[PDB]
């Protein structure tokens, strides 16, 4: 009596904690530095407390290279999930920064690339709008649910792994650009026409145009254009989230 076998409880509560905390430190909104560290640790601990008793406990000792392989596996799974989720916000940030750069908002990058003078304020605006939308669509709950679900697909125990699968996540790097253009294709196009229009004005009497009349007009036009374009991101926001989620579901397995 008075056994309280500690190794069994430790091995039951450790690896799910490692995977949950690995997702927490990288998953969007759950990985933002504004949350105190203890809150994140407690959330991981409580989620593991809820989940672990149902799972089959592992018996590999913590003092073995098998434990190191397990820890590497959990870290890989968590960071892969969090990063694949982060790709959508990367795409939204790309689209916003490009709209802002066609605004002429930061012209110093065309002359001094990476010269400590850059303000992608539109990128930040649409990034926080995307975060608000992600909060509204309860994406984080889904993330937690999928973190739990990847066990049935991929159990804690060391399992063999595949290859082109990693490429898939890396190939998801294309989406950030592709979908990014899909968010910027209308407005930039009209801005392009506006610039074309300015060109027609410069084909008249030489000089006396551009850098004096083009910048304010194009700034105001970009502002009101994409202010009107704001209602458009939400269907595209859901499209981006669905793309990331089903890509994750297909490739994680």
């Amino acid at each position: 009596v008075t056994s309280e076998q500690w190794l069994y409880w430790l091995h039951l509560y450790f690896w799910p904690l490692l995977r949950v905390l690995a997702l927490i430190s990288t998953a969007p909104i759950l990985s933002e530095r504004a949350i105190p560290k203890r809150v994140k640790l407690g959330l991981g601990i409580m989620i593991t407390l809820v989940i672990a008793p149902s799972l089959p406990a592992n018996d590999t000792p913590l003092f073995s290279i098998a434990a190191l392989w397990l820890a590497m596996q959990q870290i890989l799974i968590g960071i892969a999930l969090g990063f694949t989720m982060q790709f959508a916000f990367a795409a939204v940030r790309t689209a916003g920064e490009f709209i802002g750069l066609q605004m002429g908002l930061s012209f110093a990058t065309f002359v001094d690339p990476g010269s400590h003078l850059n303000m992608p304020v539109l990128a930040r605006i649409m990034d926080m709008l995307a975060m608000l939308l992600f909060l509204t669509f309860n994406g984080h709950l889904w993330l937690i649910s999928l973190l739990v679900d990847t066990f049935h697909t991929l159990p804690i125990g060391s399992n063999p792994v595949n290859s082109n699968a990693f490429m898939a996540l890396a190939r998801a790097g294309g989406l950030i650009f592709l979908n990014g253009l899909m968010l910027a294709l209308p407005v930039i196009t009209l801005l392009l026409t506006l610039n074309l229009a300015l060109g027609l004005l410069n084909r008249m009497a030489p000089q006396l145009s551009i850098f004096v009349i083009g910048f304010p007009l194009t700034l105001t036009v970009g502002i009101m254009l994409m202010a009107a374009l704001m209602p458009l991101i939400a269907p595209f926001c859901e499209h981006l989230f669905s793309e990331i989620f089903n890509l994750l579901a297909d490739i994680v397995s």
């Binding site: 939308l133 105001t220 009101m224 202010a227 704001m230 991101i233």
Partner: peptide, 14 residues
């Protein structure tokens, strides 16, 4: 509501 507040915000900026 989210898109309405965003649009009103950026019209205020305009």
């Amino acid at each position: 509501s989210v898109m309405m507040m965003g649009t009103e915000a950026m019209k205020v900026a305009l």
